[PDB]
Symmetry: D2
Subunit: 233 residues, 4 copies
């Protein structure tokens, strides 16, 4: 029943549900079957940066993911989010493991939404997460720690990631993501992540998403559904 717009960093090819035959970044409009994808070389144990950009003028949801060595993947998709999202939303991060696993560690997260009419703005930045993060809604296995990081999916004491895990972090305050009379409705999101795995293959990935205010983890949305969708339709 949730409405989802997401950028997925998808570490695991699930070819039978329309994934390409490689790790990819994807734009997901109300379906895990990405509307557009690009090949992504996920660098095990390295800190990546994801950037997400939209404005209501160009009506183009863009994402780019890069690592320090400079290797980057970009994906863009033409979509009017006025026709997709509710006016009011929550913004969040989601990650899953299944049969295979990885750390889904968030080191930092920033977001900006603006409505310019004829301005209303929300901006937050986390470069360190604290134990009792009162402006975050933690769902499922997602924890904030003393190490200053957001662990979306459960990690063992020994620092090793665990399978069949799902967790999300949503910003506490609802966001006014569009308003019919806004001349420009724009949002930007950036997060840094550390995906590390000793597994034969890492899985399943990390998503930035926008949803209805009351959005919660769909039941059985572990693994390939990235904690966003109740099925693969």
């Amino acid at each position: 029943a949730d409405t989802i717009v997401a950028v997925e960093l998808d570490t695991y090819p699930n070819t039978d549900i329309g994934d390409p035959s490689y790790p990819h970044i994807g734009i997901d409009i109300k379906s895990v079957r990405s509307k557009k994808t690009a090949k992504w070389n996920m660098q095990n144990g390295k800190v990546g940066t994801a950037h997400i950009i939209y404005n209501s003028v160009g009506k183009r949801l863009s994402a780019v993911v890069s690592y320090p060595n400079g290797d980057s993947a970009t994906v863009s998709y033409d979509v009017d989010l006025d026709n997709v999202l509710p006016e009011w939303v929550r913004v969040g991060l989601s990650a899953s493991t299944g049969l295979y696993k990885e750390t889904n560690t968030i080191l930092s997260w920033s977001f900006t939404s603006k409505l310019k009419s004829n301005t209303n703005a929300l901006h937050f930045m986390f470069n360190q997460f604290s134990k009792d993060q009162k402006d975050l809604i933690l769902q499922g296995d997602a924890t904030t720690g003393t190490e200053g990081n957001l662990r979306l999916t459960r990690v063992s004491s020994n620092g090793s990631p665990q399978g069949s895990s799902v967790g999300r972090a949503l910003f506490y305050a609802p966001v006014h993501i569009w308003e019919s009379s806004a001349v420009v409705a724009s949002f930007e999101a950036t997060f840094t992540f550390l995906i590390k795995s000793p597994d034969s293959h890492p899985a399943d990935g990390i998503a930035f998403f926008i949803s209805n205010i009351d959005s919660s983890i769909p039941s059985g949305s572990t693994g390939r559904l990235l904690g966003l969708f109740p099925d693969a339709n």
Copy 2:
């Protein structure tokens, strides 16, 4: 039981509870008995701008209130808010009427909090308020409308303000206002207001305040207590 730090725009002299013999702006640390005040010429029916500034280095809570014609009042008070406030807070606007009354109309409100260590940031801006303002907590008589304004205290259909009124607006998300390891903890707040009264004297005023997350209007905090304090101590 609430902990309150406020800047009060006090339109009504209550001399028996330590108000000066004129309308004033005041810095209130856990008491309506302002720690410091300055004379303020409130201009009936005109749009004022209040600016509030603090940083943990100078440890000086400053406020200035001005009108378009340029007449301004300033008040500063040396205080370590690390020693006053809880780590996590909500920020809000409050206004009251009593025996005398005024419009307590907010046309715009912006806030920025930052912690710089060895950055975490929250920024919001409302230049228009909407009917269902999902990122605001409205308490008491406070309403948001189609006129794009926040009415802290009850106004009649005919546009006239009503007595014995109290309302507040708090931003939905808790704010991390200080952190022991922050090198610089700073906040800025700005709001524009229209106080108008056909009364013999306007009352009672408008406050920007910071409180515990779960802060609510103290019972009988109408009139001279500005919806912040349960008594005049």
Copy 3:
């Protein structure tokens, strides 16, 4: 010899140089012959707002122009500005009159450029212009005044605009608009304008532009060339 990327608010149809048969907004890549245009209802004597948005991910230069009554025109054009502009630029506003004329009054101008790698930023905002505006380069007839406005084209003492006029304002500091290793290079510009004319038709329009550092008004670039181009090619 200058390299120009501009958004033109074109009040006058010059049909013989590829203008449409109506006032329009246009994206100009190294030619006054706009790569893309949209019909624009210019509202005589009213304050308009222009917004310009680009990012190096979507590679889409977008502009929207609106007035308070809400009537707006939008134009978008897919272009890699890494392949058009020099790395370092100046940003500016330009306006012209010819055989016909108008006020080309700028009431406010803001700009933001960012490079995010694996951040460098420039932001300025003018909501009032002063007599000796030391962070602006004024070219041709462009003046700043006590009325707090930038007059791009010459106005008489009696407040009436004059024909065959050209003036520009460039921000003093060069801008690093792209860098080969930037993951995201983005810029946003906003300005408010008042075009007013008692003429049979207004002319010629206002442009936001990006150029080489040493860009100057091309000789004979009054009227339909908007002070940007030395010819209509």
Copy 4:
């Protein structure tokens, strides 16, 4: 003939010109004889962060310098900069060596100035410096490199710092630092630095400063004068 307001990170005690008997941070109003100082433990070879804060309401110039291990020094001084500085200024960084020496390496520098009336803003951020930094004015020995850093004072090929060196970096654009009608005139500056020395004692230090537009290195302002002052008065 220059007018100087500076925060000095002073690594070398020059006791005969009013330095305390230890490395210190200082607020300098038109004199190298700091109006106020605080003891500073400079950590050889470590990256420090300096923060500078002023607003025209509190009228308190504050500085804090810290290192990752959390050791920090703070100094505040009550001063009306409306009565000290010209309306228009340039902002910059300065460093010197003399008989003793150190690296005066700047890794990052950000600045924000705002005038709020009844807003004009300038903001820049350098987290990487490039070889041809067109928005910086380099004076004396100051160089920008491929290592992404600003070297205020001359360093040998072998990476060792050199004595009797002075260099400054000023932002290209003049800043409107105060305006008589501004309700709030505020500025913030942050820079990160790496001072390293194999010398018996490091010298001489790094300063953030504000000056007249046409400010240049005073002759013989190497060593204890930090490239800011022509004498020790």
